[PDB]
Structure 1
Amino acid sequence: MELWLVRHGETLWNREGRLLGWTDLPLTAEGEAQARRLKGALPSLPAFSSDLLRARRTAELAGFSPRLYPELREIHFGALEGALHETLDPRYKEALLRFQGFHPPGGESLSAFQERVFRFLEGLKAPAVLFTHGGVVRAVLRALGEDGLVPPGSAVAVDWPRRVLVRLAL
């Protein structure tokens, strides 16, 4: 079943290199421009979106009116929200790289995060466009055996749960 995973436009923490999870940052001017460009590429399928501002605004600027689901949120980094990726304790860097064994204080475990994301995905009953976050897109791509890193404001279409259909980066 066709699903479009869209990573929201950039926020200030993207250029700053800070972990961005449940901190509700707005899009930058460029992030808004990225969202607008998506209007000319994304298919008009039922839309869903993380309830965080940056995702909602990306959906809006891309020409969609999404049903909001917190299950589509990026992982909650807890005390690590806003932390510079460069200064993270090696244990955290390692976990984020290998995509396993990550449980920030006051946040969600990478395991609970994935459980939340896939429960949502398996619940879908028709093709859809999903406005979400880098970590969510990464989880889905890795589940299909692919590298999950995609730029802000870009998207990847997948034939869930079989394979990746195409990547779209502007």
Structure 2
Amino acid sequence: MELWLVRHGETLWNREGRLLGWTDMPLTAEGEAQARRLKGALPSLPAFSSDLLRARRTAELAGFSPRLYPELREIHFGALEGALWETLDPRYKEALLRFQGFHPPGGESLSAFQERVFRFLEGLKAPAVLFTHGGVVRAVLRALGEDGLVPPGSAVAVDWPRRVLVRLALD
């Protein structure tokens, strides 16, 4: 199934390097710029989006009117929301780097996050554009055997659940 996953435009915590999950941070001016550049670069297909502001706003500026789904939200970092990556305990850094065995207090475990994301994708019966988050794109890319790191405001097209089709980044 052809699915286009879009990582929302940048927020302040991107350059600040803070874990951004359910904290509802808005897009920065540049984030909105990145969003607008996406208009015309993404296929005209049904759209779905995380209900978090940064995702919804990216979808809007990109020219879409998505149906909202909390299932497309970034992982919930719990007590680690807002924590600087730099000062993150090595045990957490390792879990996030290896993408396994991560369960922050008051947050969501990586395994539960993957289950949530993959169940949502499984329900898509036709090609669509998904406005979501870095961790969601990473979960999908990693499950397809590839590095899941993509720039804010960029997109990836995949043939789910088989392979990555293309990675799109604009300047």
For the criterion TM > 0.5, the same-fold answer is: yes
Q: Which runs of 4+ in 1 moved over 3 A?
A: none
Partner of 1:72: 72
* 1:133-162 Cα deviation digits (max 9, x unpaired): 000000000111111000100000001111
Aligned equivalents of 1:40 and 1:66: distance in 2?
16
Tell me the alpha carbon deviations over residues 55-101 of structure 1, each in whole angstroms, 9 at most, x when there is no partner. 00000000000000000000000000000000000000000000001
Which residue pairs with 1:146 in the alignment? 146
Distance (Å, rounded) in 1 between the aligned partners of 2:6 and 2:161: 17
Indicate the SS of the match to 1:87: coil
Offset at residue 53 of structure 1 (A): 0.2
What secondary structure is seen at the aligned counterpart in 1 of 2:86? helix
Query: Which residue number corresponds to residue 24 of structure 1?
Result: 24
Q: CA deviation at 1:40?
A: 2.0
For 1:17 and 1:162, the matched residues in 2 are separated by 32
- CA displacement, residues 106-125 of structure 1 (integer Å, 9 cap, x when unaligned): 00000100000000000101
Distance 1:161 1:95 in 2: 24
In the alignment, structure 1 segments of 5+ residues that lack a partner are none
Q: Counterparts of 2:169 and 2:95 in 1: how far apart (Å)?
A: 26
Name the SS of the counterpart of 1:57 in structure 2. Answer: helix
1:46 and 1:132 map into 2 onto residues whose CA distance is 14
In the TM superposition, 1:69-108 aligns within 5 A as 69-108=69-108
Structure-2 separation of matches of 1:118 and 1:163: 14
Aligned-residue RMSD, C-alpha:
0.4
Query: What secondary structure, in the 3-state scheme, does the structure 1 residue paired with 2:74 have?
Result: coil
**What residue in structure 1 maps to residue 126 of structure 2?**
126
Cα deviation for residue 22 of structure 1 reads: 0.2
Taking structure 2 as the reference length, what is the TM-score of the superposition?
0.99
Q: How does 1:2-81 map to 2 (within 5 A)?
A: 2-81=2-81
Unaligned stretches of 5+ in structure 2? none
